[PDB]
């Protein structure tokens, strides 16, 4: 069976229960090249996750769904067995291996649950090719209606709020925010954009490359200086990696800081997210459920010396690399979905109407 | 979302005919009503006000929610079109020199459907909608109904300029009446 | 191919000896190429030092001049800064504000004018009403009219501009003057007290000066001959 | 039927019953116009109805009128959802409109028969302007033989507060008129601040008279309860982000003197509608459920 | 299944143990239950019969014609190809963890993955990260000057060049590469023309080529000195195995 990825480096006592791997250590070193566990739709996606080739939550979901479409296409039933249950029992190890490579997100959790429900809903009398074709069609329809149409509707909704001559603050590399801003600028809206980035990923530069390619005037700065720029900021717009039933927002590490300082500076806060990203689980802090990335990314070269070079040789020293955090609902003024413009407190209501 | 609710969807098939289908759900774009015909404003934007001279709307990228005789509170300030009598008289004619090229417009190939549309015995009900949109669909060069309306109004205005008809007298309140009046005046000119 | 020639060299008296022996050498590039083609005789290996945390450039043309001015205004060459006053002169005293709006003493901004960003104003300047100045540098003692639009331009000392002008990406030397209803296209140049007549729009590539032959056009009260 | 006749119908319906809410009169006008239209197409109904909606909104710039018009049009769509034929549709329109009108007529008494249980005996009541709903709930509380003190602000633009003071003295209730700038000075002596609502935004905030927001903020500072009463038809699919975001068609025509302010749901303890006592999230839930 | 191990031979079971056994064993070190070998016919199209005396897990052998290069051998064997291929050579003695090389073929979804070693005439140039090679040429086709396009320097302004590196003749290749090989008979050998063609074709939905650098072992080259060195190092190599 698949081995277990070795935890790298000591961890903070408060984060002892969470795993922490290293990008150098790849699990494929202990797996057959002609993948014998199952066909290698596992390994491509697992390597692109562990090595961080794909980062965006929507990108991760799309890649996972394409890989699982390949899984379904290559899958064949065993004799004297039922597809509707054997498929899920076989698919569970895929999820285990993918979690081993990198912990899953809420969007992928929802996708897995939806596909498991679809497989269960498949009858026991229909033929194999029909079942495979309808599963692929269901995956395609899910992708379409839950990403593309949702993004278009959210852009149409957000076009109302974006007024002329205002300043909009964004954070990180989020496809939804970039598309919203580009489409709004297309419709003749004239405004500025302020980009806030944070170490060590520094993925905010991504959206900057978009904004200049769209001709939008822009500004760029690191997270700590946000308190300096907020007084001239008129609106704050943030993408979200997930929404919880309590109205809190699970997102990149700096989101809660921006929300808190914006509230302290009396600035409205907008959170744009798709309905499929809504998650039923709840939490009150980033300690219970998070993901610790490779701490080696924290090392930086200032001058001619790297302070954290031999951090392993100091027993007392510890490094943490958080990737997610929770923003309390009371600091959020909007959730922009295809269903419309809702408050955070109405997040569970959507979960009720989309479930049936 | 009360503006986005539309009852009948004009599906487009590409001479350039449309088909209205039962689509009773909220649309992704604002939908305007003209002569009981529903036009999705995918390319344009909803506009308000009772301003005359419908060209005043799409000049700003807008289009009224409702206008025409089908609306008791039309927002284009209706007028009279005191030239439809000869159109009604000639409506009973068939497709059959200078006369043929006079009615070669609008499609460029001579036809007589407009006079049947502009006939006195024309009650603009549900069943009469389809061809009209198809008719409009033949006018413009686009794939959206609102863009076809705009291009048809441009053609009407520029020919009215060509024949000198004092466009302040031609506000575009009723498109088919404009078409009939212009065609009849061109026929009588030669 | 990612390097930029800062034109800075550390040299030994051997460089002077090689120059005084090799008569044909005229420029640094000639010396480098000659040494790198004459390898075996007088080997004299050349070494390189690459920096990535500090700024260095050499202006050689209007393109480089504009790029360097834009970088300097945007504090790319810190500690060197227009408000730093590294040369202890009274005139270049400046105050730094949001959006890199550098203001000297006695600027007297007019009502309705807007300084958008990356703008430096020399001392003694006068600005009209509803002006829109962006990414430009205005020398000391200038005078600007009302409703003037300046984008990426560079005005030296004593330049006078009439109201209603539109100026983009051009350069105006000292004591130049522009009349009303005049539009300057990008990359234009005005040199040494040339005054552009009213009601004219110069083409894209428009370099003018008092001296007839070198400048594409020479004039003092117009652009048509 | 012409727009003018609609205007005099609306004005007469207002004048005959001063106790009737503006939205109720607007809905009655819309129903009567639908009753005599002689249309044939549902789309023709929708165009004329919405045009009359903007006509009445021009006549009266209140948020309640626009909310009632939006509710009316959504009711039209709901009735036309499952009726392909038009005559059956129209008859169902008429009958459901009669039911809707009678229910909104009884809505005020329904709110009164539920809101009065929160009035502790001997407590102090604070109110902003002349709201008929708070007057009705105070009448209900008095009917239950309860004793309480009432403070009312003057509502500087138009002194409706004095009119409410007169209407309350008509019921033999201890009432005191206080300046609009003394709310904080009175906030210490209050026990619970009940106020009517001109309109209710998506998340539970209230569109109301211009002085409401400062009173809500002061009450939140003193941690006193803050109750708002409104009817079902005052719901609307608007969502300002702050006072500036409010549409200008509601602020004015009703240096600068806006007639309208917005209060965030975080400063509201509970809402009292004919559906019951609601948290601010319940309004958003109802609006979501109504529009599929 | 998506890798089909393919072994080229155009060899001789020289040494303490048969030469062809050394690479084939590596295949059974990591999966690879089945393997296709192509033998020579210029000497005799019967070396498969001699090789059938081994004791490998499972073997498939196919004869060839008298004159046929590696690309020609792939052209002959294409009807037995259904997915991506892993071309090896009989003369190759190494202890490389193969999982590295395929990782370049896996993670980046490259069109070609190769193994290249620090030897101890042909120029290669990789990018700064040392994974994606950008240029490669030989002194045979270069007179005096090495030419680099402007576009590649625009996209990659820092190229690291290697000269003395030795190929291991191990390549993970995609199926459409084999289809293109079908489309054109102008290709006769993989190393001689095919790889530089793809390298140049990377810059005209694009082509990705990656090479992994090793520092442990080479292949038993044609010269007898390489065979002697392989014999000397075989004891140390087989001590672990």
UniProtKB/Swiss-Prot annotation, chain B:
Protein family per UniProt: Belongs to the phlebovirus NS-S protein family.
Record protein name field: Non-structural protein NS-S
Organism encoding this protein: Sandfly fever sicilian virus (SFS)
Lineage, broadest ranks: Viruses, Riboviria, Orthornavirae, Negarnaviricota, Polyploviricotina
The encoding gene: NSS
Range covered out of full length: 7 to 210 of 267
UniProtKB/Swiss-Prot annotation, chain C:
Localization in the cell: Cytoplasm, Cytosol
Stretches with biased composition (Acidic residues): 215-225
UniProt keyword Cytoplasm present: yes
Phosphoserine: residues bearing it: 209, 225
One GO term of the biological process aspect: T cell receptor signaling pathway
UniProt PTM comment: Phosphorylated on serine and threonine residues by GSK3B; phosphorylation inhibits its function. Polyubiquitinated, probably by NEDD4.
Predominant location: cytoplasm
General function of this protein: Acts as a component of the translation initiation factor 2B (eIF2B) complex, which catalyzes the exchange of GDP for GTP on eukaryotic initiation factor 2 (eIF2) gamma subunit. Its guanine nucleotide exchange factor activity is repressed when bound to eIF2 complex phosphorylated on the alpha subunit, thereby limiting the amount of methionyl-initiator methionine tRNA available to the ribosome and consequently global translation is repressed.
Assembly mode: Component of the translation initiation factor 2B (eIF2B) complex which is a heterodecamer of two sets of five different subunits: alpha, beta, gamma, delta and epsilon. Subunits alpha, beta and delta comprise a regulatory subcomplex and subunits epsilon and gamma comprise a catalytic subcomplex. Within the complex, the hexameric regulatory complex resides at the center, with the two heterodimeric catalytic subcomplexes bound on opposite sides.
Protein name according to UniProt: Translation initiation factor eIF2B subunit epsilon
Recorded name of the encoding gene: EIF2B5
Full protein: residues contained: 242 to 466 of 721
From Swiss-Prot, chain D:
Gene Ontology biological process terms in this record: cytoplasmic translational initiation; oligodendrocyte development; response to glucose; response to heat; response to peptide hormone; T cell receptor signaling pathway; translational initiation
The keyword Protein biosynthesis belongs to this UniProt entry's keyword annotation: yes
Highest taxon above the source species: Eukaryota
Annotated Pfam families: IF-2B
Localization of this protein: Cytoplasm, Cytosol
Activity regulation behaviour: Activated by the chemical integrated stress response (ISR) inhibitor ISRIB which stimulates guanine nucleotide exchange factor activity for both phosphorylated and unphosphorylated eIF2.
UniProt xrefs under InterPro entries: eIF2B_alpha/beta/delta, elF-2B_alpha_N, IF-2B-related, IF_2B-like_C, NagB/RpiA_transferase-like
Modified residues (N6-acetyllysine): 35
Principal subcellular localization: cytoplasm
Gene3D superfamilies in alphabetical order: Translation initiation factor eif-2b, domain 2, Translation initiation factor eIF-2B, N-terminal domain
Key words, A-Z: Acetylation, Cytoplasm, Disease variant, Initiation factor, Leukodystrophy, Protein biosynthesis
Listed GO CC annotations: cytoplasm; cytosol; eukaryotic translation initiation factor 2B complex; membrane; plasma membrane
Record's signal peptide: none
Molecular-function annotations in GO: guanyl-nucleotide exchange factor activity; identical protein binding; translation initiation factor activity
Family to which this protein belongs: Belongs to the eIF-2B alpha/beta/delta subunits family.
Entry protein name: Translation initiation factor eIF2B subunit alpha
Gene: EIF2B1
UniProtKB/Swiss-Prot annotation, chain E:
Modified residues (N-acetylmethionine): 1
An example Gene Ontology biological process: response to heat
Location of the protein in the cell: Cytoplasm, Cytosol
GO cellular component: cytoplasm; cytosol; eukaryotic translation initiation factor 2B complex; guanyl-nucleotide exchange factor complex
Main location: cytoplasm
Residues with PTM Phosphoserine: 206
GO MF assignments: guanyl-nucleotide exchange factor activity; translation initiation factor activity
Tagged with keyword Methyltransferase: no
Activity regulation behaviour: Activated by the chemical integrated stress response (ISR) inhibitor ISRIB which stimulates guanine nucleotide exchange factor activity for both phosphorylated and unphosphorylated eIF2.
Record key words, sorted: Acetylation, Cytoplasm, Disease variant, Initiation factor, Leukodystrophy, Phosphoprotein, Protein biosynthesis
Family membership noted in the UniProt record: Belongs to the eIF-2B gamma/epsilon subunits family.
Subunit structure: Component of the translation initiation factor 2B (eIF2B) complex which is a heterodecamer of two sets of five different subunits: alpha, beta, gamma, delta and epsilon. Subunits alpha, beta and delta comprise a regulatory subcomplex and subunits epsilon and gamma comprise a catalytic subcomplex. Within the complex, the hexameric regulatory complex resides at the center, with the two heterodimeric catalytic subcomplexes bound on opposite sides.
UniProt protein name: Translation initiation factor eIF2B subunit gamma
Whole-protein residues included: 1 to 295 of 452
């Amino acid at each position: 069976q698949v081995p277990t990825r070795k935890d790298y480096g000591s961890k903070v006592s408060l984060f002892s229960h969470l795993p922490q791997y290293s990008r150098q250590n790849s699990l494929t070193q202990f797996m057959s090249i002609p993948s014998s566990v199952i066909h290698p739709a596992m390994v491509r996606l697992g390597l692109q996750y562990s090595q961080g080739l794909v980062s965006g939550s929507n990108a991760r979901c799309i890649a996972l769904l394409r890989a699982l479409q390949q899984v379904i296409q290559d899958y064949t039933t065993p004799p004297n067995e039922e597809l509707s249950r054997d498929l899920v029992n076989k698919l569970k190890p895929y999820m285990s291996f993918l979690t081993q490579c990198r912990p899953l997100s809420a969007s992928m959790h929802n996708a897995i649950k939806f596909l498991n429900k679809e497989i269960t809903s498949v009858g026991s009398s229909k033929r194999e090719e029909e079942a495979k074709s309808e599963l692929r069609a269901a995956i395609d329809r899910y992708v379409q209606e839950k990403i593309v149409l949702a993004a278009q509707a959210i852009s149409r909704f957000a076009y109302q709020k974006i007024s002329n001559g205002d300043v909009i603050l964004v954070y990180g590399c989020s496809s939804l925010v970039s598309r919203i801003l580009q489409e709004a600028w297309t419709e003749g809206r004239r405004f500025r954009v302020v980009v806030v980035d944070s170490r060590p990923w520094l993925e905010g530069r991504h959206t900057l490359r978009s904004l200049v390619h769209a001709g939008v005037p822009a500004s760029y700065l690191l997270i700590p200086a946000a308190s300096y720029v907020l007084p001239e900021v008129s609106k704050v717009l943030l993408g979200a990696h997930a929404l919880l039933a309590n109205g809190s927002v699970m997102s990149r590490v700096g989101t809660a800081q921006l929300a808190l300082v914006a509230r302290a500076h009396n600035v409205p806060v907008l959170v744009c997210c798709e309905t499929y990203k809504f998650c039923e689980r709840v939490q009150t802090d980033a300690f219970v459920s998070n993901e610790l990335d490779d701490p080696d990314d924290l090392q930086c070269k200032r001058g001619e010396h790297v302070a954290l070079a031999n951090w392993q040789n100091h027993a007392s020293l510890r490094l943490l690399n958080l990737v997610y955090d929770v923003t309390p609902p009371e600091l959020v003024d909007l959730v922009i979905t295809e269903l419309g413009m809702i408050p955070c407190s109405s997040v569970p209501v959507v979960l009720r109407v989309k479930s049936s | 979302m009360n503006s986005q609710y539309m009852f009948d969807y004009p599906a487009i098939n590409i001479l350039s005919s449309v088909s209205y289908v039962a689509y009773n759900k909220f649309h992704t774009h604002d939908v305007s009503t003209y002569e009981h015909c529903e036009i999705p404003l995918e390319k344009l934007r909803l506009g308000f006000g009772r301003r005359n001279s419908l060209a005043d709307f799409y000049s700003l990228g807008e289009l009224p929610a409702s206008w025409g005789p089908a609306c008791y509170f039309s927002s284009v300030k209706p007028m009279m079109y005191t030239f439809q009598g000869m159109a009604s008289d000639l409506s009973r004619f068939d497709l059959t020199p200078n006369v043929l090229k006079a009615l070669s417009w609008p499609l460029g190939i001579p036809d007589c459907e407009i006079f049947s549309i502009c006939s006195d015995r024309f009650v603009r009900g549900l069943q009469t909608r389809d061809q009209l949109m198809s008719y409009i669909l033949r006018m413009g060069d686009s794939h959206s109904l609102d863009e076809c309306i705009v291009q048809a109004h441009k053609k009407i205005l520029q020919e009215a300029r060509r024949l000198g008809l004092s466009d302040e007298h031609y506000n575009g309140y009723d498109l088919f009446r404009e078409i009939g009046s212009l065609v009849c005046l061109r026929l009588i000119n030669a | 191919y990612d390097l930029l020639d800062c034109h800075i060299s550390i040299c030994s008296p051997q460089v002077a000896q090689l120059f005084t022996d090799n008569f044909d050498y005229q420029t640094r590039d000639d010396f480098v190429r000659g040494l790198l083609v004459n390898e075996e005789i007088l080997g004299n290996q050349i070494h390189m030092h690459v920096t990535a945390k500090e700024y260095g450039a050499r202006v050689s043309n209007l393109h480089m001049y504009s790029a360097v001015c834009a970088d300097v205004i945007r504090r790319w060459v810190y500690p060197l800064t227009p408000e730093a006053n590294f040369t202890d002169s009274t005139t270049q005293s400046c105050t730094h504000s949001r959006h890199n709006i550098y203001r000297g003493p006695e600027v007297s901004l007019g009502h309705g004018s807007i300084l958008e960003e990356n703008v430096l104003l020399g001392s003694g300047t006068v600005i009209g009403s509803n002006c829109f100045i962006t990414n430009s540098v205005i020398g000391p003692g200038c005078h600007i009219g009302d409703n003037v639009v300046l984008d990426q331009t560079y005005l030296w000392q004593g330049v006078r501009v009439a109201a209603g002008a539109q100026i983009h990406q051009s350069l105006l030397c000292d004591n130049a003057e522009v009349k009303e209803r005049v539009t300057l296209k990008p990359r234009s140049v005005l040199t040494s007290q040339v005054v552009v007549g009213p009601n004219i729009t110069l083409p894209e590539g428009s370099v003018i000066s008092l001296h007839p032959p070198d400048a594409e056009e020479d004039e003092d009260d117009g652009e048509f001959s | 039927m012409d727009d003018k006749e609609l205007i005099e119908y609306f004005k007469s319906q207002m004048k005959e019953d001063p106790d009737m809410a503006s939205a109720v009169a607007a809905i009655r006008t819309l129903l009567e116009f639908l009753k005599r239209d002689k249309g044939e197409t549902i789309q023709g109904l929708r165009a004329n109805l919405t045009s009359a909606i903007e006509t009445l909104c021009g006549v009266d710039s209140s948020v309640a009128v626009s909310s009632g018009g939006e509710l009316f049009l959504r009711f039209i769509s709901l009735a036309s959802l499952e009726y392909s034929d038009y005559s059956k549709c129209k008859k169902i329109m008429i009958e459901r409109g009669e039911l809707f009108l009678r229910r909104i007529s009884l809505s005020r008494n329904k709110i009164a028969d539920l809101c009065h249980t929160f009035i502790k005996d001997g407590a102090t009541i604070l109110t902003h302007a002349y709201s008929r709903v708070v007057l009705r709930v105070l009448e209900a509380a008095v009917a239950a033989k309860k004793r309480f003190s009432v403070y009312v602000t003057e509502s500087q633009p138009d002194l409706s507060g004095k009119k409410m003071a007169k209407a309350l003295c008509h019921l033999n209730v201890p009432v005191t008129v206080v300046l609009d700038a003394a709310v904080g000075y009175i906030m210490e002596k209050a026990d619970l601040v009940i106020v009517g609502a001109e309109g209710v935004v998506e998340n539970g905030g209230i569109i109301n008279k211009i002085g409401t927001n400062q009173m809500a903020v002061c009450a939140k500072a003193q941690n006193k309860p803050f109750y708002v009463v409104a009817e079902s038809f005052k719901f609307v699919r608007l969502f300002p982000l702050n006072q500036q975001d409010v549409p200008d068609k509601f602020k004015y025509k009703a240096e600068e003197h806006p007639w309208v302010d917005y209060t965030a749901p975080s400063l509201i303890t509970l809402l009292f509608t004919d559906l019951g006592v609601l948290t601010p999230s319940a309004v958003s839930d109802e609006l979501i459920k109504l529009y599929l | 299944m998506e890798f089909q191990a393919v072994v080229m031979a155009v060899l001789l079971p020289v040494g303490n143990k048969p030469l062809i056994w050394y690479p084939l064993n590596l295949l059974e070190r990591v999966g690879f239950e089945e393997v296709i070998v192509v033998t020579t016919r210029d000497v005799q199209k019967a070396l498969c019969a001699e090789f059938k005396m081994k004791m490998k897990p499972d073997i498939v052998c196919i004869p060839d014609d008298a004159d046929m290069g590696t690309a020609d051998s792939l052209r002959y064997i294409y009807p037995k190809l259904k997915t991506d291929v892993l071309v090896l050579s009989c003369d190759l003695i190494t202890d490389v963890a193969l999982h590295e090389v395929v990782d370049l073929f896996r993670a980046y979804d490259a069109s070609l993955a190769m193994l290249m070693r620090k030897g101890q005439r042909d120029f290669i140039g990789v990018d700064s990260t040392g994974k994606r090679l950008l240029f490669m040429a030989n002194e045979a086709d270069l007179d005096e000057e090495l030419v680099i396009k402007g576009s590649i320097l625009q996209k990659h302004p820092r190229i690291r060049f290697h000269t003395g590196l030795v190929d291991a003749h191990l390549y993970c290749l995609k199926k459409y590469i084999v289809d293109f090989l079908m489309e054109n008979g102008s290709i006769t050998s993989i190393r001689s023309e095919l790889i530089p063609y793809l390298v140049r074709k990377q810059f005209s939905k694009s082509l990705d080529i990656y090479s992994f650098i090793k520092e442990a072992n080479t292949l038993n080259l044609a010269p007898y000195d390489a065979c002697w060195n392989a014999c000397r190092g075989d004891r140390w190599e087989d001590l672990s195995r």
